[PDB]
Amino acid sequence: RKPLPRCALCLINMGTPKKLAQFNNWFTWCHNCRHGGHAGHMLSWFRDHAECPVSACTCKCMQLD
Amino acid sequence: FVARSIAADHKDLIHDVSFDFHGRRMATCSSDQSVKVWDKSESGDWHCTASWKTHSGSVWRVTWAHPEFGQVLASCSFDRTAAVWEEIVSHWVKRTTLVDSRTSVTDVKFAPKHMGLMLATCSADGIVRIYEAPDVMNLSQWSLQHEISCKLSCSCISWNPSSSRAHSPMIAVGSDDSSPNAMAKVQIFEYNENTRKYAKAETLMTVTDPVHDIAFAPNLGRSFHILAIATKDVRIFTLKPVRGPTKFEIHIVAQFDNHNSQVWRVSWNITGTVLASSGDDGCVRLWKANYMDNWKCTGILK
Amino acid sequence: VLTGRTMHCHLDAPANAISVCRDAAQVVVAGRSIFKIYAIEEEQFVEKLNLRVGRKPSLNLSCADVVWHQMDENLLATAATNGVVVTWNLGRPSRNKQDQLFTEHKRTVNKVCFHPTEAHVLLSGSQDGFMKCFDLRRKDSVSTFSGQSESVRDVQFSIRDYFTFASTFENGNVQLWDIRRPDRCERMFTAHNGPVFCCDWHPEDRGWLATGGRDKMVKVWDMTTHRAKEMHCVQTIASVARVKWRPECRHHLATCSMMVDHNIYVWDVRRPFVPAAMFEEHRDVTTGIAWRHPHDPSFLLSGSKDSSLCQHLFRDASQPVERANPEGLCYGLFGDLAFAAKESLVFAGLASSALSVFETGMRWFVDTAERYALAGRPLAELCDHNAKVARELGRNQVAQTWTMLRIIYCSPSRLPPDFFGVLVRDMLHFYAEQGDVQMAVSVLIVLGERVRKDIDEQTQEHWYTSYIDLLQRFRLWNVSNEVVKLSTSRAVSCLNQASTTLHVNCSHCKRPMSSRGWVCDRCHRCASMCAVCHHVVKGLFVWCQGCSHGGHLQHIMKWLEGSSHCPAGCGHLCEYS
Ligand SMILES: [Zn+2]
Ligand SMILES: [Zn+2]
Ligand SMILES: [Zn+2]
Ligand SMILES: [Zn+2]
Ligand SMILES: [Zn+2]
Ligand SMILES: [Zn+2]
Ligand SMILES: [Zn+2]
Numbered sequence: 015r016k017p018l019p020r021c022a023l024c025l026i027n028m029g030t031p032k033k034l035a036q037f038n039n040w041f042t043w044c045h046n047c048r049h050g051g052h053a054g055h056m057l058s059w060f061r062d063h064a065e066c067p068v069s070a071c072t073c074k075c076m077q078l079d
Numbered sequence: 080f081v082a083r084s085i086a087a088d089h090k091d092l093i094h095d096v097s098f099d100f101h102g103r104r105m106a107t108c109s110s111d112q113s114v115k116v117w118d119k120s121e122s123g124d125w126h127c128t129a130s131w132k133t134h135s136g137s138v139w140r141v142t143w144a145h146p147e148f149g150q151v152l153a154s155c156s157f158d159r160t161a162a163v164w165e166e167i168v169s170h171w172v173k174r175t176t177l178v179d180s181r182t183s184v185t186d187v188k189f190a191p192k193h194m195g196l197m198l199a200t201c202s203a204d205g206i207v208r209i210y211e212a213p214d215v216m217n218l219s220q221w222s223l224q225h226e227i228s229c230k231l232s233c234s235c236i237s238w239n240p241s242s243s244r245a246h247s248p249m250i251a252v253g254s255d256d257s258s259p260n261a262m263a264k265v266q267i268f269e270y271n272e273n274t275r276k277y278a279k280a281e282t283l284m285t286v287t288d289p290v291h292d293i294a295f296a297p298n299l300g301r302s303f304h305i306l307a308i309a310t311k312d313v314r315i316f317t318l319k320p321v322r323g324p325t326k327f328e329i330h331i332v333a334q335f336d337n338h339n340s341q342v343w344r345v346s347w348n349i350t351g352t353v354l355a356s357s358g359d360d361g362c363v364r365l366w367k368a369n370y371m372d373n374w375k376c377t378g379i380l381k
Numbered sequence: 382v383l384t385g386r387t388m389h390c391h392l393d394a395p396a397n398a399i400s401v402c403r404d405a406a407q408v409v410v411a412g413r414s415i416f417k418i419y420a421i422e423e424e425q426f427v428e429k430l431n432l433r434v435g436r437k438p439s440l441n442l443s444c445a446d447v448v449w450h451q452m453d454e455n456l457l458a459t460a461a462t463n464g465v466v467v468t469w470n471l472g473r474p475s476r477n478k479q480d481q482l483f484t485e486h487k488r489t490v491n492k493v494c495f496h497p498t499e500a501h502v503l504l505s506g507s508q509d510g511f512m513k514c515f516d517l518r519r520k521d522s523v524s525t526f527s528g529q530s531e532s533v534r535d536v537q538f539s540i541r542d543y544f545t546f547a548s549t550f551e552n553g554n555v556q557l558w559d560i561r562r563p564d565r566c567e568r569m570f571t572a573h574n575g576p577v578f579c580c581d582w583h584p585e586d587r588g589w590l591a592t593g594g595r596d597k598m599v600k601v602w603d604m605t606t607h608r609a610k611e612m613h614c615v616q617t618i619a620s621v622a623r624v625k626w627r628p629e630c631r632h633h634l635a636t637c638s639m640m641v642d643h644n645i646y647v648w649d650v651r652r653p654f655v656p657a658a659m660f661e662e663h664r665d666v667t668t669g670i671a672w673r674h675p676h677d678p679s680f681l682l683s684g685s686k687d688s689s690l691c692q693h694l695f696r697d698a699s700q701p702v703e704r705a706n707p708e709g710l711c712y713g714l715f716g717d718l719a720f721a722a723k724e725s726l727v728f729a730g731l732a733s734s735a736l737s738v739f740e741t742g743m744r745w746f747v748d749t750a751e752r753y754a755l756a757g758r759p760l761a762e763l764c765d766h767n768a769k770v771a772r773e774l775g776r777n778q779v780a781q782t783w784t785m786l787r788i789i790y791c792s793p794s795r796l797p798p799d800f801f802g803v804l805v806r807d808m809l810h811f812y813a814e815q816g817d818v819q820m821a822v823s824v825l826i827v828l829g830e831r832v833r834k835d836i837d838e839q840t841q842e843h844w845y846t847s848y849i850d851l852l853q854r855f856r857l858w859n860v861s862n863e864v865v866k867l868s869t870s871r872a873v874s875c876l877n878q879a880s881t882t883l884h885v886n887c888s889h890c891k892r893p894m895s896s897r898g899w900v901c902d903r904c905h906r907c908a909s910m911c912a913v914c915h916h917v918v919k920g921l922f923v924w925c926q927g928c929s930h931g932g933h934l935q936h937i938m939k940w941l942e943g944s945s946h947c948p949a950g951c952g953h954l955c956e957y958s
Pocket of ligand 3: 049067071
């Protein structure tokens with residue numbers, strides 16, 4: 015009964031329980047730097063930019079793959 | 080403006096309506112001991128997606144919370160209790176119950192997010208309380224730190240939403256007892272970080288009539304605080320800091336009596352520039368200002 | 382009619398019951414450790430004759446219920462805890478006015494009753510739950526009655542009838558009896574979810590019976606029809622002990638509580654959610670309440686455990702109805718303004734309201750947020766782009782502001798260098814005062830070190846936090862994170878570095894993998910593989926919390942749009958339905 019990591023964009027902690035669990039609330043993390051976020055938010059952010067949302071990062075966590 | 084009347088379907092008078100943080104949901108309470116939650120769709124239809132009995136007496140107010148702590152609500156009622164409700168993965172479950180109250184409970188309001196999950200409650204005997212919840216993931220454990228008495232009988236409370244570091248937490252309370260006396264009816268309580276105790280800061284002694292509702296104004300970058308008080312006429316004050324409890328510089332900026340009745344409720348907008356009053360004539364006015372600090376009118380909307 | 386004023390007097394011991402005469406001048410009060418009578422006076426009530434004669438206490442001294450006979454003023458009845466019923470004859474010259482002593486009951490006797498017309502009928506029950514009847518002709522009074530339930534609480538005669546009375550039982554059922562047929566039951570039903578503490582009849586109607594329970598409920602029952610029915614449902618803030626009905630008012634009731642609550646409440650059936658009248662004179666628990674006159678709704682008689690007897694007048698009630706705010710208000714983010722008010726201000730025509738969301742204003746905020754340029758170009762083009770963004774929206778002063786900044790700081794026997802700094806600072810402060818925290822932050826970010834060394838550090842945090850909160854209200858996430866990335870203050874930057882790094886594992890060996898790399902240190906396997914493309918995932922990696930299967934962000938999103946099955950083939954309905 016202790017919090018899980020929080021999204022880097024919406025700043026609200028993750029979690030998952032007629033779709034009771036939509037795709038946009040699934041976990042996601044860059045495998046090279048391990049900076050997580052939601053699904054919808056990250057798919058939104060990584061369209062106009064190319065850099066990790068968390069500050070002081072240098073990874074380009076879409077162009078790697 | 081335009082009207083979009085909605086069938087609330089309440090057997091008793093509606094006593095409060097409150098909006099959520101994002102502005103998409105809605106909460107209503109009534110003397111029929113029921114609280115309803117309304118959602119809206121892309122088609123602009125307000126439909127109720129929740130209804131349940133919450134107390135054993137008339138329910139006065141209901142307020143929302145920041146959605147960083149989840150979907151949390153609060154309530155106050157005539158049966159001398161206050162409860163906190165939670166939405167879970169879809170009905171609402173009672174999480175706690177505040178019982179320590181000699182007389183009826185009038186108002187309950189939350190606190191700004193930057194200082195945690197706090198609750199303030201006022202009663203009809205004179206005492207006001209401030210609770211807390213140290214673990215934000217265990218909402219069935221509330222502690223009681225402060226307990227302030229304010230002589231007269233309380234009827235309304237309001238926090239200060241200022242998030243500046245230089246502004247100390249401060250809460251203002253006003254009475255609504257109409258006796259043949261002439262005492263002050265609005266008081267301000269600050270909080271000194273050293274003694275770790277709330278204390279009186281200033282009192283507006285120019286108010287000798289009952290007060291029904293008070294409401295601060297969102298700060299959003301200003302260097303002073305603006306307060307609105309609802310009485311036989313609508314009043315607006317301004318307090319500035321100068322340079323122990325802080326001593327302000329109290330002024331006045333408005334005194335309007337375009338209602339020919341007694342004002343009941345006041346409220347501000349999101350930015351903090353337009354007020355919205357409501358009296359016994361059923362007319363909701365709005366009051367803006369100009370660059371010459373003269374407060375004008377902008378609506379007779381009814 | 383009866384005349385007087387509200388007044389109180391102090392007794393010596395707490396009282397548990399009270400009774401009054403038909404003359405409405407002397408009140409008789411009984412208790413566990415007190416027994417006396419008082420004569421009511423318009424100036425001040427005075428005692429008439431106490432019943433505590435003789436220093437020797439008895440098992441019948443602790444009287445729980447007292448009743449004044451409705452036929453003769455010389456007869457009084459007492460119910461004791463020792464299962465003994467002691468009648469009193471006021472005409473006896475001796476101080477001990479006892480007339481008949483009777484001790485059939487073993488448990489504590491709860492209630493007693495007098496026949497409205499007959500002068501020799503008394504009906505009492507004990508805590509033993511067996512119902513027993515009485516005769517005052519000194520004949521064979523033994524007609525005891527089979528309750529067949531828990532302990533009896535209250536029994537009252539029907540004034541309209543002659544041989545019918547009510548009986549309530551702690552099991553949760555109310556049984557209506559008859560006295561001509563002592564063999565079989567007439568009427569039985571379940572009234573409350575728990576014990577029933579009172580039951581009264583209608584002084585005018587012949588088919589109205591209201592019973593109160595421990596579940597904070599008072600309901601009215603009708604016996605006219607062949608089936609019992611309920612019309613009224615009045616909710617109280619505490620349990621109800623006994624109910625008295627207002628004479629000459631068919632739609633008024635009076636109730637009192639026994640724990641927690643101490644006030645006296647008056648209710649109307651047509652308004653089952655709000656009280657008609659209520660008094661706060663008493664301090665302790667109100668215990669014995671009765672109407673002074675069977676036709677005068679003016680004066681009320683009441684008593685409590687605080688050893689005092691008080692009288693109240695109807696016009697002196699404190700009215701909460703006259704101190705209730707009838708309307709509500711609330712603003713909104715988009716500009717809407719809900720508003721509800723009493724119907725009459727916009728038997729009774731004012732028992733409702735009408736929600737009315739007065740819709741139709743801040744589209745200049747999100748539009749400017751979505752296209753402002755803050756980094757990625759040198760200063761001149763950044764200023765020009767924002768000037769155009771302001772221009773098309775119609776805001777001119779902002780456009781000249783941006784253009785003057787471009788002029789003020791780009792591409793200059795000249796002006797002194799630090800000439801315009803004060804004006805820049807004042808412009809920022811002025812923009813902050815009006816509440817336009819959107820332009821201040823943008824100018825701060827665009828300029829940077831050329832202005833960051835002139836504004837106090839506690840003000841910048843205020844501006845940044847207010848702007849971020851406003852943006853998060855409208856759900857503009859990318860812009861908010863963009864601000865958090867290039868904030869000028871260290872406090873704002875470290876906002877997104879608070880528990881935003883995950884730790885991963887390897888489901889084969891359960892060991893935790895290191896930070897950089899895609900191979901396992903023990904299995905020598907590739908723990909990250911796409912369930913669809915069967916390649917190595919080095920970048921983003923989606924996941925599921927029901928079966929721990931996932932892969933590339935776009936592959937799973939594309940496949941799962943059509944099918945609702947886990948790609949790995951584990952028969953799990955990922956993302957339910
Ligand atoms: Zn998110
Ligand atoms: Zn990375
Ligand atoms: Zn990263
Ligand atoms: Zn392994
Ligand atoms: Zn793949
Ligand atoms: Zn699976
Ligand atoms: Zn799954």
